[PDB]
Design a protein around this ligand. Structure first.
Ligand code: XQT
Ligand code: XQT
Ligand code: NAG
Ligand code: NAG
Ligand code: QUS
Ligand code: QUS
Lengths: 768, 768
């Protein structure tokens, strides 16, 4: 029923070219094909018809015998191609020794499933899916083109080079699109790429299907502006027509594939919508001798091609009245002046088709040479050409292609190849073209970023979220695509440990600038400078001057009656304690070290205790003599209890060594202090307070007595005031942080009031 | 060539049964298929051979015409089935009017692609993939079974019923497994299920492939304990063999499908590894007449089935001497006592097979009744049986199946069906069986959770992470599936409002008990009661009593001679001041409101001024008396001094109006006290300090002058004591936030010392 192109020969080679368009979604069941094709149709048919005659004319290839062909139309449809393939193998049920496989991957799979049953090798020129690399299922299938694994790698490289992270995905329903999108999704989601949503659609889908697909694509338009299309040319054209219908004229960047390549028939009429698209095209130089033969073809003389008259009518819209094919649908006639030179575009994969035919010829040549080296022709051992031997010879053959490079097949039947990255641009006014803006070879992507985006303002990068590495802010993911995150700044206490978590530093520590890491907060100590410490040391200096003056005035007047009243040694240890207190004041405000830290503690424990014990063991005799031991050796009765005092601090000392803790009152600052604790400091103060209570009780006992210049009342008043000076600082000491300056002040004031109200009257009048 | 089973008839019906096993991975190219099958092989062939004879015998169906058949072996392989299908259509190049399609989905697709080119209806009994529902690509395909969309729905229902979330997935490479797993993935990822990893493998893959697959499965073993297998019976058997080999004995839960169903040939020998697995099986009642016919078959008499001798020798391991198919591999001979009744198991999908055949017959009948109603037989308008008419009659035919229900086809060529959920359990010792533990019909999943997991301890649910929603802890997702989360506690300041983020209360609130919502922690005020305020109130009461007693004494003893030197009005001013102080302390300790601290400030200002202003001028007069306008100048001096302080207080109030602030010292607690500043509490305090200094200077001037019982000495005692108290409260005030209670104490103590050192000599002297 369907027509076929013949060429007589001793050996017949089949061919499946999509001369006509895929049947519409209505007429699929009738299996009637659409309009004729030029690039994928007549050009390839003429290419095969001419290359066979070139081979036949060549004496150095397939000598003494001729190569024929039986070219059939597959209409880019699996059913039509399967029917034509059945027509191929009808003889096996002149035999077809091999076919030049169809262009579509799914169609090639369908044809191979039938052909491998009859041992008919099949060489494809544009079938690209990875599924055809499985030699277990597709043993009799070979390619002159690489698989789409390299194409998926190239697409991922392109999306990676341009910061594209949040893209959408579209692929044509079938085997090429499906496998390509699976490979792309795998190797993209592996590295860094996030897909907004993957869509699939048939090439022959209606207008409504493409409209719905474009609406779904636009649902993510503000964020995902890049659409990775592992789609055929017709799918991309349908997308462009949908864009035109609903007024989208540059909101998307279409990233095409080998299906789009640099085809002018997929952007014609809709150039404005496809501008800025980036496509991948298998590298194949133009074939000059094909152009020299094709452009001189005329319908009157071209009889061996059954589709040439229809193509001539369809291209130059006209009617060939003289010939049986007229097609009066075209109103005007064709004058003998129209030529194929005008608006001639040679298809991209012409080299591949010629290479496939040459490959089959060379395989046949090798097999013939191997079988009968002597005979020049078809030997008796070659009349029943075996498909297995031909396949074996083809799998190892190597030759020189039309381009000039070496064509050879690997273990999977594929062939080496490199890609060109083309960009659809507007060059002039009302002029669009495909510009070669890069290449991809074995993982090396050499792109040129000046022709595409001839400026710094490129396409808005398809990113879900802006880079959120701005200082404090971290990144959290809400379960959806790991590229759509939300930004939360975390507390100044913590610093970022990774991009998704920030952790806290140690108890005493602060994050560094920009929270890159963590540092140690400097320990700010009580300095020898500062207002309060310098005031304290001034106080201590005044105190020392007072003590030395009083000691001098006592040494001058040793045995005077106005002095020799009580034990003189008690009124030596009192001044000793007074001096030691101010020595403690000096020792306290200092860098916390090992020696100073126990020196200050033993001093605080020992000084006021000694002085006030001396005062008590003076007043005891002083008032018991008038109320009704003593002698002069009361110094002992003091010392022993003072020794007890010493002993108890020994008990407190042995438990707590004079170390330094690093007090942390807040997260911001760090302080260092002595090893003094509540238990270690409340006991000596408790003992001192008991002594104070006894002294106060007994100063009350004596109060007013007639003595030498009335010491008793003044010392009682000093005791009274000291009792409350001690208590004043208690709230701002127990639990506070400045307990050192308070200790210095308390000791200073206590010493001053004790010295000023017991010594000053007596020695003052003595000097006066 | 391959052997086929013939049956003469007027109309021939093709059939493709997997009589032999799938060719091994090393024999695929030769297309030599393996050992014979019983359930999927001989049983189905015998079923068709007997069903056709039943139809021929039946006069009410297809009268006056006999039904023939040409049964061929597909070996469960696409290539072998395609070869057999080519042999079916070889006449078109007695015609085959229709085939009973193969069992596999991919094999059925391959056969349909070829059959639709010749208008040959194909009815499948077990092909269940969704892809075969597309009537555009598979117009001539019908089935008596539902698609696997319902099966994926059933699997998702089962995984969601037992709260399996982090399941793993395996499917057989092909069309049934692929489509089933895509459907399951969609339907499961939609609701709440996550897939640890999806794996694919061929049925005839080697031991190494299954070992690698099982190692990858065990890589998630502790967490992903349930495996959803959209796998064929042979894939499940291979998984079981791997489990036996590498020592897995029941730490996986295999969730089978229609491929597994309740097949005993996938768990034979490896029952221990498959125990506990849950499978889905299409419901099909056992056919009784088929059992009656089948169990009486003998190799001697059964000649029409060419595979019966081989099957007989394979099943009972023995050699048949009396027939050409000796197969001397087996040692022993076959005695005339072996019967098929022993260990007989009828396959699950037998009724479907019968139904398919019946459906075809019925359709033919209908079409005949539609074409030639009068003639009984094959009318002249029916000799070239038309595929389109037969398909159209099949698509609308409805009849009664062997089960008893009504078989009919919908618009997609499918048929209604329901599923049984079976469980592989161990009944006794060394005895395993498939137990019907549930069903699934049109979305309703009935199950028996007591039969599977007899105890409450079921299989450890496949969960990637334990429920983190308990208390303050929060869920954080990493860069992987959303069913695995890290459980991290966020601080007690924050409350969780969403399961993936928690936020802190603004300034003065706390999270509730449920950590859902801030609670606005209550404010704390001075709180009438408590020990300290009660003591303060007691002191205030004592002071008021003292003031009233002194005033009563003063007003009773008006112009007594001893009280004549001191100014009466100045004493009145003093008493008024002390009374105002004791009222101000009462006012201050209370709930803070506008009016309260509107006058508490003027109290704290005036009352000390009211007293000390009078006292200073009194002392000035008493000093001028000794050193050298009585009352007239003193009152105006008091006037101007009190007025200057009143003006200062008024200006401070005007410049800084009082408002009840809600100061927040920390996040934990909130306090309210009406606004005060450094100036607001220093300027009046500084003024009164100047007053105290002046009073101290003057009463030092007078010191111990002879007077009425030397009131100067009492004044000196008063100023000493007052200065001491004022200096005493500095640390507790300026070091802590207890402003109110310390102010109460200070005011009360100053007032009481002024009331003690004065007016006590007066009262106790004038009393005598
Ligand atoms: C600050 C603190 N005060 C003291 O822990 C303290 C310790 C020692 C002294 C003293 C003294 C002194 C007095 C006179 C002569 C002399 F040699 C020494 C005062 N306060 C408390 C109890 C919280 O008020
Ligand atoms: C807590 C603080 N005390 C006061 O801010 C203060 C304010 C007023 C008074 C008083 C009084 C008074 C005394 C006698 C009669 C009278 F009517 C009033 C005391 N202290 C300081 C100075 C740190 O001690
Ligand atoms: C984003 O692309 C730019 C060039 O367009 C370049 O900085 C780099 O390839 C990408 N940036 C990063 C951080 O990788
Ligand atoms: C599964 O569903 C929820 C999980 O929290 C629970 O209420 C129920 O008891 C679980 N188990 C079964 C057998 O439904
Ligand atoms: N690469 C495609 C072939 N191809 O698809 C088109 O749309 N044009 C074209 O040449 C395939 O592998 O099927
Ligand atoms: N629906 C299944 C049918 N089936 O698969 C098996 O492995 N056994 C069996 O009956 C398929 O499409 O393959």
């Amino acid at each position: 029923r369907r027509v076929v192109a013949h060429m007589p020969g001793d050996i017949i080679i089949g061919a499946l070219f999509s001369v006509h368009h895929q049947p519409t979604v209505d007429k699929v069941h009738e299996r009637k094909c659409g309009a004729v094709r030029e690039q994928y149709g007549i050009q390839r048919v003429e290419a095969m018809l001419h290359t066979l005659e070139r081979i036949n004319s060549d004496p150095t290839l397939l000598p003494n015998i001729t190569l024929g062909c039986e070219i059939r139309d597959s209409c880019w449809h699996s059913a039509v191609a399967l029917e034509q393939s059945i027509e191929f193998i009808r003889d096996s049920l002149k035999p077809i020794v091999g076919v030049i496989g169809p262009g579509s991957s799914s169609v090639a799979i369908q044809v191979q499933n039938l052909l491998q049953l009859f041992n008919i090798p099949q060489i494809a020129y544009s079938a690209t899916s990875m599924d055809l690399s499985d030699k277990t299922l597709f043993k009799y299938f070979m390619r002159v083109v690489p698989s789409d694994a390299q194409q998926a790698r190239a697409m991922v490289d392109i999306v990676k080079r341009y910061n594209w992270t949040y893209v959408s995905a579209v692929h044509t329903e079938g085997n090429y699109g499906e496998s390509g999108m699976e490979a792309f999704k795998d190797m993209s989601a592996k590295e860094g790429i996030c897909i907004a949503h993957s869509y699939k659609i048939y090439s022959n889908a209606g207008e409504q299907s493409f409209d719905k697909l474009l609406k779904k694509l636009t649902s993510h338009l503000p964020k995902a502006r890049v659409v990775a299309c592992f789609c055929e040319g017709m799918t991309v054209r349908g997308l462009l027509m949908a864009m035109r219908r609903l007024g989208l004229a540059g909101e998307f960047l279409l990233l095409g594939s080998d299906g789009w390549a640099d085809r002018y028939d997929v952007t014609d009429g809709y150039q404005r919508e496809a501008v800025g698209g980036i496509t991948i095209k298998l590298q194949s130089p133009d074939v000059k001798w094909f152009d020299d033969y094709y452009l001189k073809l005329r319908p009157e003389t071209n009889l061996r091609n059954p589709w040439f008259q229809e193509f001539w009518q369809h291209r130059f819209q006209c009617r060939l009245e003289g010939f049986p094919q007229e097609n009066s649908k075209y109103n005007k006639t064709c004058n003998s002046s129209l030529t194929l030179k005008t608006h001639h575009v040679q298809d991209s994969k012409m080299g591949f088709v010629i290479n496939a035919i040459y490959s089959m010829a060379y395989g046949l040549h090798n097999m013939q040479m191997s079988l009968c080296p002597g005979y020049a022709g078809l030997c008796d051992a070659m009349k029943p050409i075996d498909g297995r031997k031909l396949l074996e010879s083809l799998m190892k053959t190597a030759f020189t292609g039309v381009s000039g490079d070496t064509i050879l097949f690997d273990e999977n039947g594929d062939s080496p190849g490199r890609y060109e990255i083309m960009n659809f641009k507007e060059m002039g006014k009302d002029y669009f073209d495909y510009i070669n803006v890069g290449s991809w070879d074995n993982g090396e992507l050499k792109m040129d970023d000046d022709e595409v985006w001839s400026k710094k303002s490129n396409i808005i990068r398809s990113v879900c979220s802006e880079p959120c590495e701005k200082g404090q802010i971290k990144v959290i993911r809400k379960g959806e695509v790991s590229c759509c995150w939300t930004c939360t700044p975390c507390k100044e206490n913590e610093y970022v440990f990774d991009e998704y978590t920030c952790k806290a530093c140690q108890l005493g520590s602060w994050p560094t600038d920009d929270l890159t890491g963590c540092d140690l907060i400097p320990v700010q100590y009580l300095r020898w400078g500062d207002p309060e410490p310098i005031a304290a040391v001034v106080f201590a200096c005044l105190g020392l001057l007072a003590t030395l003056f009083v000691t001098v005035v006592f040494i001058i007047y040793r045995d005077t009656p106005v002095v020799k009243s009580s034990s003189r040694e008690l009124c030596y240890i009192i001044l000793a304690g007074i001096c030691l207190g101010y020595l403690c004041t000096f020792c306290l405000i200092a860098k916390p070290k090992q020696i100073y830290c126990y020196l200050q503690r033993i001093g605080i424990g020992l000084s006021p205790a000694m002085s006030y014990s001396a005062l008590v063991t003076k007043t005891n005799r002083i008032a018991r003599i008038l109320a009704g031991m003593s002698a002069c050796a009361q110094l002992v009765i003091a010392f022993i209890l003072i020794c007890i005092q010493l002993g108890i601090i020994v008990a407190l000392f042995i438990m707590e060594p004079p170390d330094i803790m690093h007090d942390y009152p807040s997260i911001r600052e760090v302080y260092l202090i002595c090893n003094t604790t509540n238990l270690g400091v409340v006991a000596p103060l408790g003992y001192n307070g008991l002594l104070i209570l006894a002294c106060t009780f007994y100063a009350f006992k004596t109060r007013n007595v007639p003595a030498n210049f009335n010491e008793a009342k003044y010392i009682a008043f000093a005791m009274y005031t000291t009792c409350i000076i001690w208590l004043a600082f208690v709230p701002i000491y127990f639990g506070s942080n400045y307990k050192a300056i308070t200790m210095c002040f308390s000791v200073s004031l206590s010493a001053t009031v004790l010295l000023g109200c017991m010594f000053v009257p007596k020695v003052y009048i003595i000097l006066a």
